[PDB]
Amino acid sequence: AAKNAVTQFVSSMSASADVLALAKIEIKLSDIPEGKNMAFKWRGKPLFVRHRTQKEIEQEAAVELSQLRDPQHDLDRVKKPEWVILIGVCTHLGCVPIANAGDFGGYYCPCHGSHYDASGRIRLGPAPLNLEVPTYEFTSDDMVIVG
Amino acid sequence: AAATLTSKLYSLLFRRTSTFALTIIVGVMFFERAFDQGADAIYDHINEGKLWKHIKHKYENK
Amino acid sequence: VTRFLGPRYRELVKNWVPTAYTWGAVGAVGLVWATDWRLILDWVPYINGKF
Amino acid sequence: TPMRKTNPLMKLINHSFIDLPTPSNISAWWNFGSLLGACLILQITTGLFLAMHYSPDASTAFSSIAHITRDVNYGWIIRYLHANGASMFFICLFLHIGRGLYYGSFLYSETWNIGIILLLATMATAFMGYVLPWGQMSFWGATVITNLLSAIPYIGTDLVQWIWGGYSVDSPTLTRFFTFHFILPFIIAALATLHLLFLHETGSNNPLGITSHSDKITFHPYYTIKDALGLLLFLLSLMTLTLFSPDLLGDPDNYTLANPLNTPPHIKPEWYFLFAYTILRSVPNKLGGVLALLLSILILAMIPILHMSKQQSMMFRPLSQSLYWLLAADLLILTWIGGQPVSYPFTIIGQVASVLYFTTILILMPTISLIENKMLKW
Amino acid sequence: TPMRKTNPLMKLINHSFIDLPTPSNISAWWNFGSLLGACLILQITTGLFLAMHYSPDASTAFSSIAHITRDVNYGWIIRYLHANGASMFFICLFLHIGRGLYYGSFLYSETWNIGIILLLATMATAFMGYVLPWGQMSFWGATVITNLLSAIPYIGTDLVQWIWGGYSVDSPTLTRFFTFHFILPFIIAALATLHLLFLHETGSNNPLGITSHSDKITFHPYYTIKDALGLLLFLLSLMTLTLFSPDLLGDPDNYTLANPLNTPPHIKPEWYFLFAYTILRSVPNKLGGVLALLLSILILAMIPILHMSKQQSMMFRPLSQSLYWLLAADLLILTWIGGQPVSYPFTIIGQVASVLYFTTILILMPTISLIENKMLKW
Amino acid sequence: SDLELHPPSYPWSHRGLLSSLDHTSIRRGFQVYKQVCASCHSMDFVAYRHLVGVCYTEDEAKELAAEVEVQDGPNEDGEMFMRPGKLFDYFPKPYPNSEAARAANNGALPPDLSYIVRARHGGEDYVFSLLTGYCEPPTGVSLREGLYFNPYFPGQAIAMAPPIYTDVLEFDDGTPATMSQIAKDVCTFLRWASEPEHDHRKRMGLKMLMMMALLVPLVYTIKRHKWSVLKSRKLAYRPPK
Amino acid sequence: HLVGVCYTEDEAKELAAEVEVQDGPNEDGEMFMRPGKLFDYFPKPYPN
Amino acid sequence: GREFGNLTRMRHVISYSLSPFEQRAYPHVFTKGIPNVLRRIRESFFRVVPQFVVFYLIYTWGTEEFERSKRKNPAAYENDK
Ligand code: HEM
Numbered sequence A: 001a002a003k004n005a006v007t008q009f010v011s012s013m014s015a016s017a018d019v020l021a022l023a024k025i026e027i028k029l030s031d032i033p034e035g036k037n038m039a040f041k042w043r044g045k046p047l048f049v050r051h052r053t054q055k056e057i058e059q060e061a062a063v064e065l066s067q068l069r070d071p072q073h074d075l076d077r078v079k080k081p082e083w084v085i086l087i088g089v090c091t092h093l094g095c096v097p098i099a100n101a102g103d104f105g106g107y108y109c110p111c112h113g114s115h116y117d118a119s120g121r122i123r124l125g126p127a128p129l130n131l132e133v134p135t136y137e138f139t140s141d142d143m144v145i146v147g
Numbered sequence B: 001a002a003a004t005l006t007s008k009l010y011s012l013l014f015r016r017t018s019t020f021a022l023t024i025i026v027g028v029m030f031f032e033r034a035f036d037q038g039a040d041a042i043y044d045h046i047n048e049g050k051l052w053k054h055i056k057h058k059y060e061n062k
Numbered sequence C: 001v002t003r004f005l006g007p008r009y010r011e012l013v014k015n016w017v018p019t020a021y022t023w024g025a026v027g028a029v030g031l032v033w034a035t036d037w038r039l040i041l042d043w044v045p046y047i048n049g050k051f
Numbered sequence D, E: 001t002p003m004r005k006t007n008p009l010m011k012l013i014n015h016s017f018i019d020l021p022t023p024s025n026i027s028a029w030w031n032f033g034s035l036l037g038a039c040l041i042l043q044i045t046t047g048l049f050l051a052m053h054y055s056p057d058a059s060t061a062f063s064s065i066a067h068i069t070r071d072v073n074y075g076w077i078i079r080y081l082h083a084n085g086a087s088m089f090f091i092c093l094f095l096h097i098g099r100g101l102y103y104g105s106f107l108y109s110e111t112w113n114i115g116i117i118l119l120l121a122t123m124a125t126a127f128m129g130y131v132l133p134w135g136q137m138s139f140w141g142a143t144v145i146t147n148l149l150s151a152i153p154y155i156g157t158d159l160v161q162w163i164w165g166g167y168s169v170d171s172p173t174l175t176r177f178f179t180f181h182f183i184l185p186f187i188i189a190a191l192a193t194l195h196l197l198f199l200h201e202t203g204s205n206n207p208l209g210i211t212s213h214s215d216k217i218t219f220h221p222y223y224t225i226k227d228a229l230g231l232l233l234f235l236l237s238l239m240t241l242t243l244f245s246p247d248l249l250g251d252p253d254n255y256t257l258a259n260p261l262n263t264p265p266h267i268k269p270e271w272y273f274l275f276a277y278t279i280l281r282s283v284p285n286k287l288g289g290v291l292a293l294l295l296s297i298l299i300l301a302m303i304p305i306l307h308m309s310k311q312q313s314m315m316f317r318p319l320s321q322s323l324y325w326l327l328a329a330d331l332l333i334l335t336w337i338g339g340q341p342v343s344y345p346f347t348i349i350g351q352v353a354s355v356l357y358f359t360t361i362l363i364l365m366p367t368i369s370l371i372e373n374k375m376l377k378w
Numbered sequence F: 001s002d003l004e005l006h007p008p009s010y011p012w013s014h015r016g017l018l019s020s021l022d023h024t025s026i027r028r029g030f031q032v033y034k035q036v037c038a039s040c041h042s043m044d045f046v047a048y049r050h051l052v053g054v055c056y057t058e059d060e061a062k063e064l065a066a067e068v069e070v071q072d073g074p075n076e077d078g079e080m081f082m083r084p085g086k087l088f089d090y091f092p093k094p095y096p097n098s099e100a101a102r103a104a105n106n107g108a109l110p111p112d113l114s115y116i117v118r119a120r121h122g123g124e125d126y127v128f129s130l131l132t133g134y135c136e137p138p139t140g141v142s143l144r145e146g147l148y149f150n151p152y153f154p155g156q157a158i159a160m161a162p163p164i165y166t167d168v169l170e171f172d173d174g175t176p177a178t179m180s181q182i183a184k185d186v187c188t189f190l191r192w193a194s195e196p197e198h199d200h201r202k203r204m205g206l207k208m209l210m211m212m213a214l215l216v217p218l219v220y221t222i223k224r225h226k227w228s229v230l231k232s233r234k235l236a237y238r239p240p241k
Numbered sequence G: 001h002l003v004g005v006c007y008t009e010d011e012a013k014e015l016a017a018e019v020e021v022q023d024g025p026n027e028d029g030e031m032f033m034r035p036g037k038l039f040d041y042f043p044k045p046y047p048n
Numbered sequence H: 001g002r003e004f005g006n007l008t009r010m011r012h013v014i015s016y017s018l019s020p021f022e023q024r025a026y027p028h029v030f031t032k033g034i035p036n037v038l039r040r041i042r043e044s045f046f047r048v049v050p051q052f053v054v055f056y057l058i059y060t061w062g063t064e065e066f067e068r069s070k071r072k073n074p075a076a077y078e079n080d081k
C-alpha cells in the first residue's frame, strides 16, 4: 500500500493531462508542395515545415563545411533531405524570418536582414548559430510526429 | 512425530532477518501482481457491459 | 586506517559476507520493485501485468 | 551503554519516544492525541502538493481547482484526502479535548492552556483554508465571518478593511489567506512540541486518575503497535470516507463560482465551526454574539479553576457523568441547530441550548462535585 | 531557587541563551554565526509579506511584482530588503564557513556536516527564489541549471521533465518553485536547531584553539550586547545597501519579461553562485562538470579527514595561513571569472583557478601541515 | 415562497456502492448534449479529450473535434483566424460573454453544466426531475409569459423553455428516443461530466476494502501478541508478617 | 501616480480624459469606447 | 529525572509473566471475552443513552414542528376564509 501511496504523489508532479495534450502533438499532412512553406504553432514556438526540390538539396550539400558561420553537415542534420522542419524563431533577437526568402533560398529575417540557406543554417547577418532542428520522426507516409 | 512445515520454513527463511526481509520483498513482488489482477478481475466482473474497454468491440482492430 | 586490516578482521568480514550479499539482494530487488524497473521485470515469469 | 543514550540526537528520540514511562492502563482515547500529530503530517504533505497547482487569484483559483481535480494526475484523491482529512482532524481533536474534560487531564494546566492555543490556531487555519476554493460558500463565509469584526466598537470597520486589504473580499484577500493558511500549521507543529514539552516532565495521566508510578511501562513495544493500530483505523475511516462518499461531509452548492452579486439561499459554515455559529445567531445584538463566541472557546481555560471534586477521573463520579453526556448531547443540539434556517422552533432551542451550555460548565458541575464530595464524607 | 531553573521553557532558555558557558576570548567572527540566525528571521518575515501579493503564474508573475514595487504601499522597501537580504545572508554565510575552516572548528564533525546539509538547503532556497521573479536571467538560469540534472546518465531527461512538470520551463515549474521556496527555509530552521543541539554539548571553540574550561563565562551579560552591536552593524550595512544602491548586487535584464524564444547575452547567474558556475565553464564534459560541481561543495566534508596538524587554529601556523588566504584569493578569482564571457584570457585562468582550488586543499594543505609538524619538533 | 418539492430518489445504475457508470449512456447523453444543450450551455472545463478513454475512440475524437471551428491567436497582423479545432480544445462557448447570454434569455443566465450536478442539492436527482417535470400552472397563481412553471425549480418559475420532448433527436445507437431516455442519458452524461474519476474511484475503493480487511485482523493479532504478556500476568503480594 | 509627483489631481483628471479607451460590454452590446479616468493605464499603441 | 531507575518506592510485590510465544493471542474468547464486553455495555448503557434519546425526541420535534411552521401554509389561507 505504501508504494501505491508514494509513487502516486510522485505521479502528481510528473506532468498534467493538458500539458501533455498541448505539447508534442502536431500531426501534419505531407501534402505540402516542394519549396512551399507552412508555419505551425508548437509548444509556443513558431515552426515552419517545407518540402524541397532535389536541386536545393544539391546546392545545400555543395556548401563547404568550413565556410558556414555555424558549421554543421547537412546530411547529418535532416533525416530525409527533401523535407525540412525548423523552429520559426531566428537565433539573433528572436524575430520570425519570412518563409521561402533570402538570397540563399532559405529564410530571411526582416528585423535585421539575417539570411538563411534552404537547410536553415545561418549564412549571413548578425545571428550567430543555425536555426534549431527539433527531434522528430515520420510515421505514416502522409503524417509526422513533431517532438 | 511428523514435522510441521513451519519447522523447516523458520529454519530456512525466517532464521535470519535479512532473508526474512528478502522473502517479504519477493512476497510483495508476487502479491502485487496477483492481488491487483484479482481485484481488477472482480471489479470488471460486477459491472459487465458497462466498462468501455468491453465496449471497444463496436470499433477496434479495424 | 592501516590498523583495520588484520588476521581477525578478515575473519569478521568473512563472517558478515552472507549478510552483505543478502541485504544487497534486498536493496536490489527492492529498488527494482519500487521503481517498476521495466528491463528486469520483462524477464520475470509472472510479473507481467505491464503491457 | 546503548548507542541511543550516547548520541545527543538519539537521547531526544530515546526519551520522547522509545523509553518514556506511560501508565499501563491507558485506553483507546489516549491514542487520539498521537493521531492528531499524524493528521497534521497528513494535512501538510497532502496539502503541499495542492500548493503545487493552486493559483491564489480571484479569477484563476477555481479554474486551478478544476485543473487539480481533472488534468492533474491523481489530484482529486489529494484534494479529497485533504479536505476530508481536515474534518478527520477535527473529529480526532474534539474527541481529544473530550477525554481531557472527562478524565481530568486538565489539571496539567499549562499543557491545557497550550492545547487551547493550538485549538484557536487550528480554527484560524481551517477557516482561512476554507476560503481558498473560492466557491459560492467560501466568499460569503469569509464575508460574514469577517463582517463579525465590524462589531468591535472603535476599531470596527477599520480593522475589517485591514483584513480584507480592500473594501470587500477579493483577490488580495484570497492571497492573504493563502499565505496565512500556508504558514499557521508549521507554527502549530512547534507549539505542539511545546505541548509535549510541558506534558512529558510530569507523565501521562491514567483513566483511574490515581498516580501510576508503581506500574509504568516503556512506550515502544506496546504503544508503538497500539498507536499503529490507531493509525490504521484512522486510515480506514479516512480512505473509506474519501473513496466511497467524498462529498457527504462536504457542502453542495459550493462548486458554483462565487458571485458577489448573489447570496446563496442557506449559507452556512462547515460543521466543525458551526456549533459556535449558533451562539452567534441565537444571541441578540451584534457584539454580544461576538463576546459569546469568544467565551465559548475561552471557557476551557476557566474550567480547571472551577474544579471542586477531591478526585480527578470522571469514572468514579456518575452524577457528573450524566451532566457530561448531557453536555455532549447539548453540543449535538448546537450542531443540528446550526445546520438549520432561522425560525422560532430553531431559535428557541438555540437559546436554551446555549444557556444550558454555559450553565452546565459554570453552575451545575461544581455543585454536584461538592455533593459528591459530601456523599463520600469528605 | 531561581524560576529559570524550574519551568522547562525557562530551563531551555536558561541553557541555550542566559547561562551556557562560552570562551571569554571569542572574537568578532563568531558573531557572524548568530547573525545568520538573525538573517533567516528577516528572510522569513520580509518574504512573508511578498507572498501576499505575488502570483506564481507565468503569465502574471512579473506584473504582480510590478504591483508590489508600485501599487502596494511601502512594497519596494520590502522587495529590496528581501533581495539584498539574501545577499547579506550568503555573505555572513561565507564568512561563517571561512571562520570554521580557519580556526579548526571542523573537528566538531557532526555539527560540521549538519552545517553542510543546511548549506545545500539554503542554496536550493536561494536558487528557486531567484527563479520566482520570472525575468530574463531568472527564466534562463532555470533552464540552464535544470538541464544539468539531465546530465545524469540513465534517468536524466525523465527526471528533468519531472522537475519541469512539462517539456519546458513554464507556469507549473514556477508554481512548484514557489512552493519549495516557501517551504525550505523553515526546514533550514529546524536543521539550525539540530545544529545548535550538537554544538552545545561540547561548547564553542576559541581562537587560540586551547580548551577554555578555565575561563568559561555566561552568555547573557556580554555576548548578547556584543551580538546586539553586530546585529546593529548588520542592519546598518543592509540598509545602506538597500536605500542607496539597491541594484548593484543585482543584475539588469530581470526587469525584462522572460522570452522562451529570445536569448539574453551575458547570461550570468547571481553572484554567490558564480564561482561554482565557473567550474561548469571549466570542464568541457557535461557530466564531468556536474560532478566537479557537486564536489565543489561536498569537498567540505572531507576536510576533517584531511586534517594532519596537531593543532586547531591557523594563527599559530603561518604557512597554512598563507595557503588559506591563497584559497580566499582563488575564490575571488573564480567569483570574478563567473561574471565574464568565454574568451581566450578567461577560459585559461578559469581552468587554472579551478585546478588550483582542488589541489591546494586536497594536497598542499596536509603536506605543509606535516612540515609545520616537523618544524616544531613533534 | 414555499420551499421547492423534494425530488424522489431513483434506482440508478451507478448509485450502487461498487457499480460503475454505463458508458453507452454517456455516449448517447453526449449526443444529446451536442445539439439540444450546446446551443445555450457552456462547459468550461471539458476538452474534446477526456472522451478519448471513456467513450469515443481517439480517432473518432479527432474526427469529432474538427466538426466545429474554434477561435485562435493572431497570424500576420491580428486578424485572429479560426481553426477547424483539435482535441485539446474545450467545448465551444454558446455566447462570447455572459451579458450576451442574458440578452438572449430575457436577462436569465444559463449556468455552466460542468459542475451543475454536484452543485445543486440532491445532486443529479435534482436534474432529471427538473426535466421530466413540467406541470401546468396551479389555479390562483400567475406569472410572466416568459417565465415557465417548473415546480422543482426553487423559484418555481424557471426561465428555461421545456428543452426536450419525444424525438427532438435521433440517437445513432438506434435506441428509441423517448424524452425519458433522453433525460436519463443527459443526467448520466452530466454526472460523468462532474465526476470523471468515478469509475476509477470505485475500483480503488474495492482494492482498499480488500487490503484493509486483510490488514486489520493481522495488526490486531500483532498487538494481542505484544500485549499478551501484560494481560496474562498475575501479580501477588507477600508481606513478611 | 502623477498626482503626487507633478500634476494636481484635477489636472490629471483633465489629462486622462483627452485620450479614450474601450470599456466593458453594454447590455445586449459590447466594447464601447470610454473617456477614461485616473485609474486607467497609459494607452497601448497596438492590440498585440 | 523521572526515569525508571528512580520513581515510587514499593516493597515485595511479586509478579509473574509468560513469553508471548508460550501462549495464544486469543485465550478463551467466547467463554470470557464476549460476556465481558456485554457486562461493560450494560454498565455504560443507562449512564450514556438516555440523554441521546432525549436529544432525538427534540430533533424529531424540531423538524416536525418546523414542518407545521411552514408546510402548514394552507392553515393560513384557511384562516383567510
Ligand atoms: C494539534 C493539536 C494537538 C496535538 C498534536 C496534541 C498532542 C498531544 C499528545 C500526543 C498527547 C499525549 C497523550 C495523548 O496522546 O493522549 C497530548 C496530551 C494532552 N493534550 Fe493534546 N494535542 C493537541 C491538542 C490539544 C487540545 C486542543 C487540548 C485541550 C483543549 C489538549 C490538551 C491536552 C491535555 C490536557 C493532555 C494530557 C493527557 C494526559 O496527560 O494523558 N491538546 N496532546
Ligand code: HEM
Binding pocket: D040, D043, D044, D045, D047, D048, D050, D051, D052, D054, D065, D079, D082, D083, D086, D089, D125, D126, D129, D130, D131, D132, D133, D181, D182, D185, D186
Ligand atoms: C492542520 C493543518 C491544515 C488544515 C486543517 C487544512 C485545511 C484545509 C481545508 C479545510 C481546505 C479546504 C479544501 C476544500 O474545502 O476543498 C484546505 C485547502 C488547501 N490547503 Fe490546507 N489545511 C492545513 C494545512 C495546510 C498546509 C500545511 C498546506 C501547504 C503546505 C495547505 C495547503 C492548502 C492548499 C493549497 C488548499 C487549496 C486546495 C483546495 O482548496 O482544495 N494546507 N486546507
Ligand code: HEM
Binding pocket: E039, E040, E043, E044, E045, E047, E048, E049, E050, E051, E054, E065, E068, E079, E082, E083, E085, E086, E087, E089, E122, E125, E126, E129, E130, E132, E133, E181, E182, E185, E186, E188
Ligand atoms: C534563508 C532564507 C531565504 C533566503 C536566503 C531568500 C532569498 C531570496 C532571494 C535571493 C530572492 C530573489 C529576489 C530578487 O532577487 O529579486 C527571494 C525572493 C522571494 N522570497 Fe525569499 N528567501 C528566503 C526565505 C523566504 C521565506 C521564508 C519566504 C516566505 C514567504 C520567502 C518569500 C519570497 C518570495 C515570495 C520571493 C519572490 C517575490 C519577489 O521577489 O518579489 N523567502 N528570496
Ligand code: HEM
Binding pocket: E029, E030, E031, E032, E033, E034, E035, E036, E037, E038, E040, E093, E096, E097, E100, E105, E106, E108, E111, E112, E115, E116, E118, E119, E192, E195, E196, E199, E203, E204, E205, E206, E300
Ligand atoms: C543560517 C545558517 C546558520 C546558522 C543560523 C548557524 C547557527 C550557529 C550558531 C548560533 C552558532 C553559535 C556559535 C557562533 O555563533 O559562532 C554556530 C556555530 C557553529 N557553526 Fe553554524 N550556523 C549556520 C550555518 C553554518 C554552516 C554553513 C556551517 C559550516 C559549513 C556551520 C558550522 C558551525 C560550526 C562548526 C560552529 C561551532 C562554533 C565553534 O566551535 O566555536 N554553521 N552556528
Ligand code: FES
Binding pocket: A090, A091, A092, A093, A094, A095, A109, A111, A112, A113, A114, A125, A126, A127
Ligand atoms: S532579430 Fe533576428 S536578426 Fe535582428
